């Protein structure tokens, strides 16, 4: 979120906008290295919700 004065010089209003833009219109992939000296914190996240018991004792009603 960014607060900035209206683009047109005639409009004297100060406005609030939401940003979904980048420094490059067609984003490029960067290749870099992270050293242990940078106080690195490693933790695992889950994007998609899928189940955790890999083995299933399935029962079928007679």
């Amino acid at each position: 979120t960014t607060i900035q004065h209206a683009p047109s010089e005639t409009d004297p209003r100060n406005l609030l906008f939401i940003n979904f833009a980048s420094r490059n219109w067609n984003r490029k992939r960067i290749t870099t290295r992270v050293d242990i000296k940078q106080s690195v914190t490693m933790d695992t996240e889950t994007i998609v919700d899928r189940s955790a018991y890999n083995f299933a004792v399935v029962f079928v009603k007679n």
Binding site: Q4, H5, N14, I36, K37, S39
Partner: protein
């Protein structure tokens, strides 16, 4: 020669009151610590040492406050006055002075003692402790620099001289170098050489209803911060102080003082910390600046 300790009520101010704690009736002696402490955030992995960021911490200065009165009446009046003067202002400026430097530190009253253990004619020997706001900064005058035209020399400067209809020769090294610029008197640089933390400026506006004040530029000519105000009438002068503790912005016209805070451009004023570059005067006829720049240890 020897060290001098002044105690100012409001330095940079018309209502300043100075106390000589080195020569006057109320004297400061034996400062506890004038140095500094630092926390470097050093974390070590497998014997190898990695260093973070140093937070320079300033410690409380405790002085052996002595009074030099002639009577019990004098010594009491000195304690009732000196201590209340420090209390009247939210913070007091201690000036450290020596043969080589004149630094200043903004103090706040931490602890003062009053006891009935008197010497002769009701003499006082007590301990006064102060809390550090900002330790060691240089309060100095800031002025613009003028550019002057170089002298005209035959054969060296670009001129059509000597035998008619004039002649200028291309030589190797000496060749033709421009003398100066037509009306070089327009060029004025307010140079910023070191990072300034706070300031106090007096600005004289030219045109009313035109944003008036100062903008700051970096080494590449880009604006990062600006103190600009759009008034209705021509103010005699605009008194601006960047000090965090007593921030002052005001427009003076005659004997009347006007608050300029709501009229100020809030988007242009991005930072208080001034970086290496230059200052430009927006709609100003004259400007007077007093710059205060920090030093950790002196």
């Amino acid at each position: 020669g020897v060290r001098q300790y002044k105690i100012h009520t409001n330095l940079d101010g018309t209502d300043d009151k100075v106390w000589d704690v080195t020569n006057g009736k109320v004297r400061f002696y034996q400062p506890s610590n004038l140095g500094l402490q630092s926390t470097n955030n050093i974390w070590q992995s497998n014997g190898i040492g990695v260093m973070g960021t140093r937070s320079i911490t300033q410690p409380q200065i405790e002085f052996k406050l002595e009074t030099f009165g002639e009577s019990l009446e004098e010594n009491y009046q000195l304690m009732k006055d000196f201590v209340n003067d420090i209390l009247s202002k939210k913070f007091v400026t201690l000036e450290y002075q020596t043969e080589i430097f004149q630094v200043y530190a903004d103090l706040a009253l931490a602890d003062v003692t009053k006891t009935e253990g008197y010497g002769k004619n009701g003499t006082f020997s007590e301990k006064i402790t102060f809390d550090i706001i900002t330790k060691w900064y240089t309060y100095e005058n800031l002025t613009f620099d003028k550019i002057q035209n170089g002298k005209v020399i035959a054969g060296m400067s670009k001129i059509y001289g000597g035998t008619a209809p004039g002649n200028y020769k291309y030589i190797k090294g000496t060749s033709y170098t421009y003398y100066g610029e037509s009306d070089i008197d327009r060029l004025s640089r307010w140079d910023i050489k070191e990072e300034i933390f706070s300031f106090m400026g007096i600005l004289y506006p030219k045109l009313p209803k035109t944003p008036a004040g100062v903008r700051f530029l970096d080494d590449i000519g880009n604006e990062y911060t600006a103190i600009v105000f759009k008034t209705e009438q021509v103010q005699d002068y605009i008194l601006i102080n960047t000090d965090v503790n007593d921030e002052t912005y005001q427009g003076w016209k005659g004997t009347t003082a006007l608050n300029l805070f709501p009229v100020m451009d809030f988007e242009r004023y991005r930072t208080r910390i001034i970086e290496k570059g230059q200052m430009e005067l927006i709609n100003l006829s004259k400007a007077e600046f007093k710059i205060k720049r920090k030093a950790d240890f002196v």
